[PDB]
Design a protein around this ligand. Structure first.
Ligand SMILES: NCCCC[C@@](N)(CC[C@](N)(CCCCN)C(=O)O)C(=O)O
Ligand SMILES: NCCCC[C@@](N)(CC[C@](N)(CCCCN)C(=O)O)C(=O)O
Ligand SMILES: [Cl-]
Lengths: 297, 296, 296, 295
C-alpha cells in the first residue's frame, strides 16, 4: 500500500489585495471549502497563479493552508512543481517540513524534457521527501506529456508516488493507466469530465469549479466513490456549462472573476501576464454563474 | 423514436482473389448472431466501403439482411458518402432491401461546412423512414459534426436517433448527453466503450467484436444493466487488443487477427490497403494469444 | 522524366441547375490560357471531385483537353481516388483522352499505410505512360505521404516526377529537395506559393488563379527567372485574397468570388457543399475590391 | 536600433553542477571568430529554466564582457512567465550593457492576447534597448497572434521584431505582408533560408553552436540576396539541423558539442538529461558529415 490523498479537492485561487496576497481572505476561502465537504485543498498550483508568486509567497500560502486545515480531516496537497528539478525539490522539502500532507508536482513546463528526464525529475523529488507525491499531467500548458509508461514506472519505482492528476482530456489514457496499474490513484484535473474519470475508477478530482461551487463538486465526487453513478452524472451534467465557461479565458482568469462577482473576494486582481477578462467574457462569466446556487461564508 | 442500440459489430469484408467472398461473409455474420451481438453493420469503414463498388456494397447489405432474417439481430447498414446524392442513393437501397437502419459517415475529403452537414443529413433522413445514426470520425474525414449540428439534426429529423462517436473526446460525449439526453450515443471507439456507456451511452459499434463478439456483447449488456463493475472489468481486459487492433489503420489489424485465428482463409485487402508491417504483425499475433476466440 | 510545371490552376466546376455547365467551363479555361497559365487541373478538390459522377469527371477532362489543344497549355488531369482501381481507371482514361499528365491525391478517409501509399501510386504510375504528380493534403485526406515514400516513388517510377504539397509544412519542402533535388515540388497552398518556389519549387497549382490568373502566373514566372523580390511582392500583395479564399472550405469561397466577379452564371454547389454564410459572402466581396480582376 | 543577422542561442556548459564560466567565454569567442553577428545568452538553448536568477545574470555579464571590443552584439535572454521577473531581467540586461533583449512568451500560465500585450508593454517601457519578441508555441502553450505582434511592434518603439519558432511559414508571410518593417528572425534552423528569402533579416540558431561559420555564411549570403548560395548551405545543413532536435533542445546540441570536444562534460540540469543510446549514435553519425571548427 501507499499513503494517498484522494476525494474532492480544490485548486485554490490566490486572492490578491493591492498586488499582495490577501492572507485572511485566503484562510476564509479555505474555511469555506472545509465547511462545504471538500476533502483536500491544493494551495498555489496553476489556479493559484504559482507562476507569478515569489518562492517566499508560495511558501507562505502553503503555510496558511496547513494552519487552516489543522484540526480537521482536510488534507493539504501542496503545489510543489517546477520546470527546474532543484526548485521542485526545494518546494517538496518545504511542504514536507511545514506539515503539508502531500505534494502536487506538475510536469516540467517549457523545457520539454524527455520521458527519461521526466523519470529522473520525479524520482529525484520523491527521493527527497517522506510524503505522497501526485504527478500532474497537463500537456496544453507544459508542452510535454508524461506517457503512461513513465507514470506507471514512477509509481512502481517510487514508494511515495501514488498517482497522477490528468488534465489532457484523454479518456483512453485513463483506461490505459488503470487497466495496467490498478493501484494508482487517478485524479481528474479536468472538471467537465469529472464523472467519466471517476466512473472508470478515478478516485478524486482537483477542481477549479469547487472554488465557486464546493458543495456540488464534493457531492459529485462522493456520490461516485460510493458508486451512485446516476446522481454523480446528474451533477456533472448540470455543471458542464460553468465547467466550460471557466475556461473561456485561461484559468484562473474566469474562476477569479466569478469569485469576485459572487462577492467572495474583495477585488478582481491578477498579476501580469494574467489580467482581467474582456468585458465580453466578463458578461459571459456573469451569465453562467447566475444559473447556479452559490454558497456564502 | 425507433432505434437501434446494444452490442453491434462493424463487419469486415472478406475477399477471395479480389472478389467479395459472399459465403465467408454470411458465415462470419452468423458467428456474430450466435454470440449474442444485437446488430451488424455491413460495409462501414471496417468493411472497406471506400474500395467496394456500389454494387458490391449493395450485395453485402443484402447478405446481412437475409442472414439476420429470422433472428433478433438488426442490420445497421453502412450507407455514408462524401457526395450527398451517393449517400441518399445508398440509404434508399438500404431501406428498400430490408435493413433496419442506416449508419451515415460524415462527408470526408471535401470538408463541408456545418450548414452543409445539416443539409447533407437532412437530405439523407428525408429520403427514408428508417432510423438514421450519425457517424463522427474527424480523424478520417477532416471534418467534425459539431455538438450543435448533431443536436439540431436529432431534434429536427424524426428518424435521426443519435451519433456514433469515434473521436476520442469524452468531453463531447458529456456535452451531447447533457444538452440532449434523449439521443442514442454509440461508442465507435472500442478502447473506451465502457467510459462512453457509463455516461449514458446506449451501445457500441465495435471492431473488436469481429474477433471477440461474446466479450464485447457481455460488456455492453453489463453496462446497459447498470452493472458497471463487470463492464469495466471486461473493458480493462479488452484494452490491450482494443489498442493493437488500431496499431495500423482499421481494418488492417482486425483482418490480420481474423486471419491468424483462422476465421478467414486469406488475408486480402483492396489497395491502397495492404498487409500490416511485420512488427505490427507480430504484436497482433502475440496479443490475441491472451484471449479466447470463439470459432464457428 | 517528363514534367508539367509552372503556373497551374485548379479549375472550379461551375454548375447550372444541378448539372455541369460545360460551356462555362471552356470559357473559364480560355480565360486561364489568355493570362499566361501554363497548365490546367480539371476536377481536383477545387473542382468538386467528390460530388461529380465518374461520367461527369471524364466529361470535364475531355473539355479541358480540347480547349487546350491548339495551345501550349497542358492538361494535368485530376485522377485521384481513395480506391486504387478507381484511380487507375481515371488515369487510363486520361491517357487515352489526351491529358498531358495526371494529378493523383493521396487516398482519403481509409488512411492507407506508407506501404499502401507506395503500392497505390506504383499501380497508377505503371498503368499509364504519362507523368504522374503526387498530391499531399493531410488536412483533407487524413493521411500523409511521408518524404521517404515520395522520394522512393520518384526513384522507382519513371513517370512520377513530383508532389503537389498542401500541408503548410515548409520543413518538409526543404527535406524533399535537400534529399532529392531532381523532383518537381509544386505548391498546393496559395498563401505560401513564394516560399515554396524560392526554395526551388518549380510551380504552383492554384485556387486563387481562378480569380487572378495573371497575378499567379506572373508570380510563378518571376520566381522561375529568379526574380524573387518581384515574386515575393506579388505573394505579399495576394495574401489577403489567398486567406479569404479559405474562410470557408474550398471551393466555396473561390466559386463565390467568381460569381461576384461575374465570371460564372450562378453560385451553385453539389451537397454536402453549399453557399457561404452571408457574412463570409460579404468578406469575400470586401477583399476582392482591392485587386484588379481580369475580365472574361 | 536593431539586432539582426546571424545569431547564436548559446548553450550553457556545466562543470560539477556549476556553470563553467570560462568554458562559456571561450565558446563565445569561438562564435565571434566565425562571423557571428550576435550571441543570445541563456535562452531556451542556454537552459534558462534550470539556471538560477544569479547564474542567469552571471551568464549575461560574461557574454557582454566577452563581446566588448567587437562588432558582436549581446541579445540577452530575459524572458519569463511572470512579468515582474521579465522586467527584472530586462532592467539587469540594460544596466549591464546588453545591446537588446530576447523575451519569450509567458509559458505554462497561458496569458490572453491582452495579457501578452500588457506583459511586453511593461517590459518595453522598463528599458530603452531593443526588444525582440519570441514565439515558440510548442514550449510555451500559447501563441503571440500576428495581430498582437504587429500591435506591439507599432505601439512600442523598442519592440523591433519577433523570433519565430512555430514551424508556420504561413504566419511568417502574414507578419511580413502586413508589417514588412519588422525584423522577422528564424528560430527554427531547418527553415532558416525560407524565412530569410521571404524577408527575414537573420537567425537565432542552435546549429550555430556547432557550425557557426556555416550558419553565418548562410545568413549573410541570404542577406546579400545570394539565395542560390544560401539555399545550398541550408540543404547541406538539413541533416544536422533535424538531428539536433531528435530529442528536446538542447539535449542534442550539447551532446554534439561534447562529442566534438567543444565542452568538457555532457552535463545537464534535471529535468534535462543525456540522450538515449540510439540518439547518441545518430547524433555522432550525422556530425561526421560536417567540418566542425575549433577554438
Ligand atoms: N512559485 C514559485 C515561483 C515560480 C517561478 C516561475 N515563474 C519561473 C521558474 C523558472 N524555472 C525560473 C528560472 C529563472 C532563471 N532563468 C523559469 O523561469 O523557468 C515559474 O515556475 O512559473
Ligand atoms: N461505398 C461504395 C462507393 C465507394 C466510392 C469511393 N471510393 C469514392 C467516392 C467519391 N465520391 C466518388 C466520386 C468519383 C468522381 N471523382 C469520391 O471519390 O469522393 C468512396 O465513397 O470512398
Ligand atoms: Cl533560445
Amino acid at each position: 500500500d501507499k499513503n494517498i490523498i484522494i476525494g474532492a479537492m480544490t485548486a485554490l485561487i490566490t486572492p490578491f489585495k493591492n498586488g499582495k496576497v490577501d492572507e485572511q481572505s485566503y484562510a476564509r476561502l479555505i474555511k469555506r471549502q472545509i465547511e462545504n465537504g471538500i476533502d483536500a485543498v491544493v494551495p498555489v498550483g496553476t489556479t493559484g497563479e504559482s507562476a507569478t508568486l515569489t518562492h517566499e509567497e508560495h511558501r507562505t500560502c502553503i503555510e496558511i493552508a496547513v494552519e487552516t486545515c489543522k484540526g480537521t480531516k482536510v488534507k493539504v496537497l501542496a503545489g510543489a512543481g517546477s520546470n527546474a528539478t532543484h526548485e521542485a525539490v526545494g518546494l517538496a522539502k518545504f511542504a514536507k517540513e511545514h506539515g503539508a500532507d502531500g505534494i502536487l508536482s506538475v510536469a516540467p513546463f517549457y523545457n520539454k524534457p524527455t520521458q527519461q528526464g521526466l523519470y529522473e525529475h520525479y524520482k529525484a523529488i520523491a527521493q527527497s521527501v517522506d510524503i505522497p507525491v501526485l504527478l500532474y499531467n497537463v500537456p496544453g500548458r507544459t508542452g510535454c506529456e508524461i506517457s503512461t509508461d513513465t507514470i506507471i514506472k514512477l509509481f512502481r519505482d517510487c514508494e511515495n508516488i501514488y498517482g497522477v492528476k490528468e488534465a489532457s482530456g484523454n479518456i483512453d489514457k485513463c483506461v490505459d493507466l488503470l487497466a495496467h496499474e490498478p493501484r494508482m490513484m487517478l485524479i481528474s484535473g479536468e472538471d467537465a469530465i469529472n464523472y467519466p474519470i471517476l466512473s472508470n475508477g478515478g478516485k478524486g478530482v482537483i477542481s477549479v469549479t469547487s472554488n465557486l461551487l464546493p458543495d456540488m463538486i464534493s457531492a459529485l465526487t462522493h456520490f461516485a466513490l460510493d458508486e451512485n453513478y446516476k446522481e454523480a452524472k446528474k451533477i456533472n451534467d448540470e455543471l458542464y456549462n460553468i465547467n466550460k465557461i471557466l475556461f473561456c479565458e485561461s484559468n484562473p482568469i474566469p474562476i477569479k472573476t466569478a469569485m469576485y462577482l459572487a462577492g467572495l473576494i474583495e477585488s478582481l486582481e491578477f498579476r501580469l501576464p494574467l489580467c482581467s477578462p474582456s468585458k465580453e467574457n466578463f458578461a459571459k462569466i456573469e451569465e453562467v454563474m447566475k444559473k447556479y446556487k452559490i454558497k456564502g461564508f
